[PDB]
Amino acid sequence: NNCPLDWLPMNGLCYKIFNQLKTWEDAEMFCRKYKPGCHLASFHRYGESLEIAEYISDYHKGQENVWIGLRDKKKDFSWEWTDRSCTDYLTWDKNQPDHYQNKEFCVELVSLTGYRLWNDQVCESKDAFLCQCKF
Amino acid sequence: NNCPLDWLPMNGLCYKIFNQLKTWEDAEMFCRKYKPGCHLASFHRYGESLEIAEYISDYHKGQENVWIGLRDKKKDFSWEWTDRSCTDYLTWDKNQPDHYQNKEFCVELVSLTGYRLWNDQVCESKDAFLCQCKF
Amino acid sequence: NNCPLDWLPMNGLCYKIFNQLKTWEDAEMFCRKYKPGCHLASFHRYGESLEIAEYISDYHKGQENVWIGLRDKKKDFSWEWTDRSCTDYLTWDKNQPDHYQNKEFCVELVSLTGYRLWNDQVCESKDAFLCQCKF
Amino acid sequence: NNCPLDWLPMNGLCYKIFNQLKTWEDAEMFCRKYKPGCHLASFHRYGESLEIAEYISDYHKGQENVWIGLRDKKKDFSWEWTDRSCTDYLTWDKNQPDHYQNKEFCVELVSLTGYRLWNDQVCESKDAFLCQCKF
Amino acid sequence: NNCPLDWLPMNGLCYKIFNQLKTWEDAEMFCRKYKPGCHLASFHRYGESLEIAEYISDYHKGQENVWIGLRDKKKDFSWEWTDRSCTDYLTWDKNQPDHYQNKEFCVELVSLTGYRLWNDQVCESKDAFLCQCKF
Amino acid sequence: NNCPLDWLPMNGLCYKIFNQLKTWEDAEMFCRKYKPGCHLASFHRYGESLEIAEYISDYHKGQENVWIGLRDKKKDFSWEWTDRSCTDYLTWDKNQPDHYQNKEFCVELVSLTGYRLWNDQVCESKDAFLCQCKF
Amino acid sequence: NNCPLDWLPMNGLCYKIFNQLKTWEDAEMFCRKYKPGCHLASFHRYGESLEIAEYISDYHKGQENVWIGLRDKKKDFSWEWTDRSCTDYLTWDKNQPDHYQNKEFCVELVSLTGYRLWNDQVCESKDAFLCQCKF
Amino acid sequence: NNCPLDWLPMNGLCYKIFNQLKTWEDAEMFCRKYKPGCHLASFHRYGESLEIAEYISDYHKGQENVWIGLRDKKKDFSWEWTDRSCTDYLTWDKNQPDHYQNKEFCVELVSLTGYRLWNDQVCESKDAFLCQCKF
Amino acid sequence: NNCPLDWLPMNGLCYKIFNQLKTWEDAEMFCRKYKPGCHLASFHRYGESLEIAEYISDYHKGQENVWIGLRDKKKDFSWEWTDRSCTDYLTWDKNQPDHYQNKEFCVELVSLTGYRLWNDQVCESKDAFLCQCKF
Amino acid sequence: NNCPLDWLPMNGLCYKIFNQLKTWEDAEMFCRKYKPGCHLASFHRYGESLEIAEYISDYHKGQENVWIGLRDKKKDFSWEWTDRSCTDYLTWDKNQPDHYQNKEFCVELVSLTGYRLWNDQVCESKDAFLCQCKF
Ligand SMILES: OC[C@H]1O[C@@H](O[C@H]2[C@H](O)[C@@H](O)[C@H](O)O[C@@H]2CO)[C@H](O)[C@@H](O)[C@H]1O
Ligand SMILES: OC[C@H]1O[C@@H](O[C@H]2[C@H](O)[C@@H](O)[C@H](O)O[C@@H]2CO)[C@H](O)[C@@H](O)[C@H]1O
Ligand SMILES: OC[C@H]1O[C@@H](O[C@H]2[C@H](O)[C@@H](O)[C@H](O)O[C@@H]2CO)[C@H](O)[C@@H](O)[C@H]1O
Ligand SMILES: OC[C@H]1O[C@@H](O[C@H]2[C@H](O)[C@@H](O)[C@H](O)O[C@@H]2CO)[C@H](O)[C@@H](O)[C@H]1O
Ligand SMILES: OC[C@H]1O[C@@H](O[C@H]2[C@H](O)[C@@H](O)[C@H](O)O[C@@H]2CO)[C@H](O)[C@@H](O)[C@H]1O
Ligand SMILES: OC[C@H]1O[C@@H](O[C@H]2[C@H](O)[C@@H](O)[C@H](O)O[C@@H]2CO)[C@H](O)[C@@H](O)[C@H]1O
Ligand SMILES: OC[C@H]1O[C@@H](O[C@H]2[C@H](O)[C@@H](O)[C@H](O)O[C@@H]2CO)[C@H](O)[C@@H](O)[C@H]1O
Ligand SMILES: OC[C@H]1O[C@@H](O[C@H]2[C@H](O)[C@@H](O)[C@H](O)O[C@@H]2CO)[C@H](O)[C@@H](O)[C@H]1O
Ligand SMILES: OC[C@H]1O[C@@H](O[C@H]2[C@H](O)[C@@H](O)[C@H](O)O[C@@H]2CO)[C@H](O)[C@@H](O)[C@H]1O
Ligand SMILES: OC[C@H]1O[C@@H](O[C@H]2[C@H](O)[C@@H](O)[C@H](O)O[C@@H]2CO)[C@H](O)[C@@H](O)[C@H]1O
Ligand SMILES: [Ca+2]
Ligand SMILES: [Ca+2]
Ligand SMILES: [Ca+2]
Numbered sequence A, B, C, D, E, F, G, H, I, J: 001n002n003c004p005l006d007w008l009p010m011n012g013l014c015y016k017i018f019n020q021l022k023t024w025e026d027a028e029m030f031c032r033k034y035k036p037g038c039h040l041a042s043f044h045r046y047g048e049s050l051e052i053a054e055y056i057s058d059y060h061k062g063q064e065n066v067w068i069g070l071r072d073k074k075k076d077f078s079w080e081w082t083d084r085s086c087t088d089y090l091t092w093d094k095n096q097p098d099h100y101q102n103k104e105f106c107v108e109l110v111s112l113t114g115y116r117l118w119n120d121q122v123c124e125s126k127d128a129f130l131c132q133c134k135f
């Protein structure tokens, strides 16, 4: 009804992991250009993080990390979602975010954590990615 | 429509009884692989038990017991649903759960009770099963 | 399109008259086996009665009365709907229900009242019937 | 979606102009038998008159007037809608309704006014007609 | 799904930029004649401007401006939407509207502003256009 | 609180039986002049009839009938509520309304029916009355 | 409660007729300074005209007309409400508005019509006035 | 806001235990006559039972049992609430209901269970009671 | 009455201008200490801007600008509301914000724009201010 | 209004910090005795922690830690809220909970963290406390 068969429906939106590897920026443009009304995913509750993590664990083969829509463009710990939603929830991995070497401003789901925790990472890294769309 | 023709729409979700016999664990992952977001069914009110019980008695094939999403992971009688909803409702059959022979940590609907009551059973045993999805 | 094109959409559900003549219980089992989530129809509002009456008058030829889902299972004047919804609405015909000779425990729409009012009738009578479904 | 592609969705219902010419009675019965849950159209606010008027102009060419669901069944200026909705809104053309020569009891949208205003007319006149359905 | 796959679902409606050059009036008629209930788009919220601006930037390349449904038919700065919705939100570009040379009465989204802001333009100019439909 | 302590809160409105005897018109004017936005009560649901019937039985002793806001001003059975709400629910007593002797045009709740059913009565008769107000 | 006892609650706002005589400008400023969130009244549906008309008749005796919030600020028949709401509804008296002798730019409810219909009048005329507030 | 200080607010309603002792019938009439829109309490979810039980334990001194609105007038296990709500939830004590000596048709909260479980009891018994009101 | 009589009710909250002149931070602490749940005002809709502008123009004498709750805490152009609501709406004045000489990090309504548009200003400036509260 | 003047309204409930020092248990029963339905506060999202933290820092008296409704009854680290809401959120301070000296099974907001983080503490120790009510 709300979403096509191969998309995860949650709180009015539809989510899908893509196994293809891309930079954070390339992943966002792809989601946006996939169908009108799409972006890399934004998270707003713990239940979402867990339902999403399990979904990726079941539908994604490999240990590659997954890009999500959070980023720090101003480069000063002001994380914002590409979909323009509120940053009213977080779940950083242990010791994150750390702006490692001052080159990490794009967020990724950490494979080692069952895709449940976030990590700021180099945007030029090649990760799989999670799109979020309205249908 | 809210659900495909052969699914039971109920309080916003869709349910279906599958007659193929599987272990509790394979019944779960089967549901999750039918479509992203599905799980073995969870119950939260008396009306659902009755509705579900009637649906199964009308649509199943055979006289098998049915696996649902409730399971005792810690083995300390701490029942949790695979869909992560709160365990705010329970409807055990007479004298259950009994962790019989300390080898029962999975819940099934009991066929002899017309599929209304629950019973903790051996997870490696095979049963028919009830999936729950959001479309 | 909440319903197939040959069903009447009404307050979240779908309705359809079946002109084949059946006993009250055979009608209920036919609705039940039609598709999951169906029963003989339940009524909860004055507006539903008038809408259903006209629908029946237009799609139901002849003057056979029509079975709906109300019945007195305990034979004690406690009317219940087969869909388990609340009995919070009643529109009995003149001098009904009367449990005539204590042999009438099933409810039908009365052809003579333009299918607006109800009558308790011998359950084994053959009437056309109104199914209700969730799609 | 709320309506088929060939229909106009407005405030919860679906509307379609039919260009076949019919008497008011035949137009009402055609709508009723088109599919369950339909009637000639009722109007309740100025926006609806304006939206319908433009819709007909775009999808109904020619100078034929259009039947709608208002009629004077008691013949004493008691205008009621066939869909049983409230007569809480009227938009009569200049000097209407007038029961001209006591032969006018059905209401049509007047082509010369761009289908904005109403006229009471001989029910046996052949006009195009506007149906309203629930899907 | 609320909209066809190549349309943008937004607050109950569906939007689509058509990359064809037309005068303001031809663009309105094209939308109106597409399916019943469409018009050049109306805007009522800041979030809509941002969402539309981004969508247009991604699905409409080049520098052609885009027609929207606002127009000053009376020519005394009384801006009205073709879909008759209320003019309760405005987002004019710097120093607009200005009725430049008494020849500008139709509104367009300005490419140079990233399609975020509005400008009144000569109605016979050729722009791409944004349709809005209710499905 | 939605209503003063001696008024019955029901579906957004406040109701109160006044145990004073008045003609139908004096009863309407009394309610109207009580506070801005009051009228003799209008009814739209079966649940309201039951709730009101019980309330009146408990707070109005004796056998005097009770005026409600339904009246046939035109005298051709066109029943309208004084609060201008839609006449979309009726619950006439046996064989009513009958315009007995061409002198009955105002409606009252019938004491002998437990204030559940309606009757058209001579407007100059003295009944207690039921006011409805928006606070 | 939604409004004080001395005010009429209608569709979310509160209305009160003031019997003091004032020019249209003084009436608008009195409403604004009465308390934050008030203006002379705006109308958007026929029900409101009818409810307001009766309210004024009951709580405003005498033959004085009543100021409401509609006015032609540009002086070219561009009627706008002081509360910035949409002019989506009009109910002018016979042959109004007429800009009689080019001195009429403010709108009053006409006493001779029972306060149902409107007239454009000399803004400096002393009329009673209707305020609208949020509480 | 919703309820007076000494009442427990839950799901739109207000609840209060009265320490005075009365028969079931006398307790119901008292609630009804206390203020318009009151009855002995009805329960519809487990959380209600527990929040209520705790409230009574804290505000009620003594070990006397508490009457609630459930009863079996037809005397055949058809329990219904005096407030006319659905019987979509139950929580009988161990081995209840038992229609002991065929003289128990009124329900009471069992003090020994911390007022959490129900017991069918003699209606002529003197218990404290829980009223439920709308304000 | 969602608010005290000297406050402006608006979309669930209450607003009030304070004419005393304070630095941006002293204004925020004054709103905070006024009553629990108060801050300098946040804006989220075009309609709020216009309503607040008129309210200020009527209850605020003089031309002192007015502090609102937006500020750039990280001094990096990342504007946040003191009430922690989402920055999903902006209405900057011409050529603002400009961080003039890198000393302006607090936002005020501009008197010259009729209090409609915003300007980033030196936080130590003395302005009147707008509080917002939940009552 | 939703709450009394000296209470903090937040997501439908009312909160207040009490400075009187009490044991965790007496703080709980004190809240329950302030009004039926109250309990020590429960948290379910990051925004509440921040809102509450700020409120307390502004309205308390002293530098005491604050008791909240979370407590480990079974002493097996199974935290439950006194208001019976699900424990779907947690925000422990550094290295907590530690069941230190196996004598800590009650949670307090830590003053040195600006009242944002939690810590399990000795239940017999005294602290300021945060009540939560529904009015
Ligand atoms: O060194 C900081 C760096 O950590 C990376 O993640 C580490 C992780 O913290 C560590 O526990 C694991 O063993 O190896 C990972 C990969 O080196 C992050 O990817 C990076 O963003 C920084 O946070
Ligand atoms: O012995 C515990 C065991 O009981 C099984 O159920 C029994 C049931 O108790 C008995 O009354 C019936 O006749 O036979 C059933 C099947 O042996 C449960 O299936 C099992 O899970 C345990 O609970
Ligand atoms: O007499 C009890 C019996 O009545 C039937 O209804 C009658 C009805 O009263 C009469 O008006 C009509 O002409 O004939 C009907 C059929 O004989 C009911 O159908 C039956 O259920 C009983 O209630
Ligand atoms: O004479 C009453 C008659 O009017 C018809 O309408 C007229 C209309 O008023 C006039 O402006 C136009 O030029 O000619 C129409 C047709 O003669 C109505 O159609 C008819 O119903 C009567 O009301
Ligand atoms: O001069 C009025 C005219 O402005 C056009 O916009 C111009 C703008 O004036 C100029 O400064 C900028 O460099 O180029 C813009 C695009 O041509 C408007 O497009 C036109 O409608 C008038 O308003
Ligand atoms: O006869 C018409 C008349 O009926 C009154 O009701 C009577 C009823 O006719 C009678 O059978 C019963 O015993 O007493 C009723 C109460 O007087 C209506 O009240 C009146 O309005 C007319 O409809
Ligand atoms: O002549 C235009 C003039 O009309 C006034 O209203 C008239 C009204 O039309 C008439 O029916 C009544 O008897 O006398 C009124 C007052 O002369 C309007 O008040 C005025 O504004 C003009 O429109
Ligand atoms: O004897 C059945 C009878 O039980 C009463 O309750 C008992 C309860 O079951 C028992 O465990 C306790 O020791 O004493 C109670 C009082 O005798 C019920 O009150 C009655 O309704 C029956 O169910
Ligand atoms: O020049 C930057 C400076 O501008 C101030 O605003 C000016 C405004 O540009 C001008 O139109 C008006 O006449 O005078 C204002 C005050 O000098 C802003 O107030 C200031 O914050 C900076 O943005
Ligand atoms: O030792 C465990 C104990 O810690 C207390 O908190 C300490 C805190 O760890 C330390 O950093 C700070 O300087 O002093 C605090 C007070 O001693 C907790 O209060 C207590 O509950 C335990 O967790
Ligand atoms: Ca990192
Ligand atoms: Ca078992
Ligand atoms: Ca019968």
Ligand SMILES: [Ca+2]
Pocket (backbone or CB within 6 Å): D096, D097, D098, D099, D100, D104, D119, D120, D121
């Ligand atoms: Ca005519």
Ligand SMILES: [Ca+2]
Pocket (backbone or CB within 6 Å): E096, E097, E098, E099, E100, E104, E119, E120, E121
């Ligand atoms: Ca221009």
Ligand SMILES: [Ca+2]
Pocket (backbone or CB within 6 Å): F096, F097, F098, F099, F100, F104, F119, F120, F121
């Ligand atoms: Ca009568």
Ligand SMILES: [Ca+2]
Pocket (backbone or CB within 6 Å): G096, G097, G098, G099, G100, G104, G119, G120, G121
């Ligand atoms: Ca005039």
Ligand SMILES: [Ca+2]
Pocket (backbone or CB within 6 Å): H096, H097, H098, H099, H100, H104, H119, H120, H121
């Ligand atoms: Ca018993």
Ligand SMILES: [Ca+2]
Pocket (backbone or CB within 6 Å): I096, I097, I098, I099, I100, I104, I119, I120, I121
């Ligand atoms: Ca500036």
Ligand SMILES: [Ca+2]
Pocket (backbone or CB within 6 Å): J096, J097, J098, J099, J100, J104, J119, J120, J121
């Ligand atoms: Ca600790």
Ligand SMILES: [Cl-]
Pocket (backbone or CB within 6 Å): C044, C045, C046, C047, C089, F044, F045, F046, F047, F089
């Ligand atoms: Cl009803």
Ligand SMILES: [Cl-]
Pocket (backbone or CB within 6 Å): E044, E045, E046, E047, E089, I044, I045, I046, I047, I089
């Ligand atoms: Cl907006």
Ligand code: NA
Pocket (backbone or CB within 6 Å): A013, A041, A042, A043, A044, A132
């Ligand atoms: Na999301």
Ligand code: NA
Pocket (backbone or CB within 6 Å): B013, B041, B042, B043, B044, B132
């Ligand atoms: Na479930």
Ligand code: NA
Pocket (backbone or CB within 6 Å): C013, C041, C042, C043, C044, C132
């Ligand atoms: Na039904």
Ligand code: NA
Pocket (backbone or CB within 6 Å): D013, D041, D042, D043, D044, D132
């Ligand atoms: Na209609």
Ligand code: NA
Pocket (backbone or CB within 6 Å): E013, E041, E042, E043, E044, E132
């Ligand atoms: Na739009």
Ligand code: NA
Pocket (backbone or CB within 6 Å): F013, F041, F042, F043, F044, F132
């Ligand atoms: Na009413």
Ligand code: NA
Pocket (backbone or CB within 6 Å): G013, G041, G042, G043, G044, G132
């Ligand atoms: Na208004």
